[PDB]
């Protein structure tokens, strides 16, 4: 009621070289209008580190192709309240914080999910 519920794993542990699905779903009393829905995914190397946007939904998916190489993919379905992303062939440098920011107009509250991705040997 006082915020948009966003469900993500607080910590996600993935083996080096495997594919990492970053799950993110949300709740809203309004359906998802692709002409107004907003999604931003950002990455940080560390807690205090600058955020780097790497994927957006604005009318459609925009993959910013950050020099992640071409390993980021969208893995969700906005109309089904799923905004997950996929990081293929995870590398040690992918360790860090992944933020999902969600707006579903006319729902007032913005959602925020935060995942700490850790890369195992």
Author numbering: 27 to 93, 95 to 148
Question: What text appears in the publication on this structure?
Answer:
Voltage-gated sodium (Nav) channels are part of membrane-embedded signaling complexes that initiate the rising phase of action potentials, a crucial event in generating and propagating electrical signals throughout the human body. As key components of these protein assemblies, β-subunits (1) modify Nav channel-gating properties; (2) regulate channel trafficking and localization to distinct surface compartments; and (3) influence channel oligomerization. Structurally, β-subunits are single-transmembrane segment glycoproteins with a short cytoplasmic C-terminal tail and a large V-type immunoglobulin (Ig) extracellular domain that may participate in homophilic and heterophilic interactions, cell adhesion, and cell migration. Of the four known β-subunits and their splice variants (β1–4; gene names Scn1b-Scn4b), β2 and β4 form a disulfide bond with an unidentified Cys within particular Nav channel isoforms.
The construct encompasses residues 30–153, and contains a single Cys mutation (C55A) to facilitate crystallization [The C55A mutation is located on the protein surface and therefore unlikely to affect the overall structure.]. The hβ2 configuration displays an Ig-like fold, consisting of eleven β-strands and three 310 helices. Other than the mutated Cys (C55A), this domain contains four additional cysteines that are arranged in two bonds. The first, intra-subunit bond, is strictly conserved among all four β-subunit isoforms and is mediated by 50Cys and 127Cys buried within the core where it links two opposing faces of the protein. The second intra-subunit bond is located within a loop that spans residues 70–77 and connects strand β5 to β6 via 72Cys - 75Cys. This loop constitutes a unique feature of hβ2 since corresponding cysteines are absent in β1, β3, and β4. The loop containing the 72Cys- 75Cys disulfide bond is modeled in a dual conformation. Of note is that the N-terminal region of hβ2 is structured rather than disordered in hβ4, adding an additional short β strand (β1) which interacts with the novel β4 strand. The hβ2 subunit possesses a corresponding Cys at position 55 that is located in a longer loop which may result in an altered spatial position of this residue when compared to hβ4.
